[PDB]
Amino acid sequence: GSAHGPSAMVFTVIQGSGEPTDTVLRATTLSCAYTAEGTHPAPRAACDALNATDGELNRLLAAPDPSLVCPMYFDPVTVTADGVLNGRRVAWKHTFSNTCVMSANLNSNPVYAF
Amino acid sequence: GSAHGPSAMVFTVIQGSGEPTDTVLRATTLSCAYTAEGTHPAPRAACDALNATDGELNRLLAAPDPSLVCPMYFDPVTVTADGVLNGRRVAWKHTFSNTCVMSANLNSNPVYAF
């Protein structure tokens, strides 16, 4: 493992496409070291999930359960991830069509389980 | 106060000018609500300091103690602040000439007292 260093992150969920104006619906902090802590409700599970991506946070998204159905109205919701992970600076975001589509693609992934 | 919402941040100190490659020396998490918590060593004091800027983090820098002296070698160090503060998304950075210059301009400001 080439990546080694501090692991401190902030995750947010934004109502909109990520315009500086957009309302931030909710957010959590996360620190991963001897202890796994923050306002994140499942800190160790979120730390494990982040480590499993090997620093490429697009890997937090997964092919959805094929039996799930979503309405198709466009009401965008954006997830953000910023900070440091195993010593490398992280600045990541992803915009979903609506909350149903977000839930379908973000598994039950501990990272955005807040 | 127009700004209202979640307050969750990550602060880092980087060896260099802030290139994606640069080594992250240290980092802290901070959450400001009923409790002030995170890996930050003085959470409530850092929360108060952030609120005092009214969202403009350039206000974390102050005219230094005029009796301080620093070497002038260029060995840049960059501070970063990312997350959400009273509902508004924050993505801020500042590069100092060296660590002495950083210390002189960042007061004894609780935010970067880690």
Chain B nearest CA to A87, separation (Å):
6
Contact B30, B9 (CB under 8 A): yes
Three-state helix/strand/coil letters over chain A: CCCCCCCEEEEEEEECCCCCCCEEEEEEEEEECCCEECCCCCHHHHHHHHHHCCCCHHHHCCCCCCCCCCCCCCCCEEEEEEEEECCEEEEEEEEECCHHHHHHHCCCCHHHCC
Strands B36-37 and B77-85: unpaired
Domain tally for chain B?
A: 1
Distance from CA of B109 to the nearest CA of A (A): 20
Range of the domain at A60: 1-114
Rounded distance between C-alpha atoms, residue A66 and residue B114, angstroms: 47
* Structure token digits, residue A35: 């202890």
The whole-angstrom distance between A51's CA and the closest CA on chain B is: 17
Resolution in A: 1.9
How many cross-chain Cβ pairs, A to B, lie less than 8 Å apart? 91
Q: A40: annotated binding-site residue? A: no
Question: Closest Cα partner for B29 from A113, A83, A50?
Answer: A83
Kindly tell me the burial class for residue A107, based on how many C-beta atoms sit within 10 Å of its own C-beta (0-12, 13-18, 19 or more): middle
Question: In this complex, do B80 and A89 lie within 8 Å of one another by their Cβ atoms?
Answer: yes
Nearest alpha carbon to residue A6 among B17, B90, B28: B28
Cα–Cα distances (Å) from A31 to A18, A63, A91, A103, B29, in that order, read: 24, 27, 16, 24, 7
* CA–CA separation, B18 and B24 (whole Å): 9
**B23, A87: Cβ pair inside 8 Å?**
yes
CB atoms A8 and B8 under 8 Å: no
CATH code for position B7: 3.30.350.10
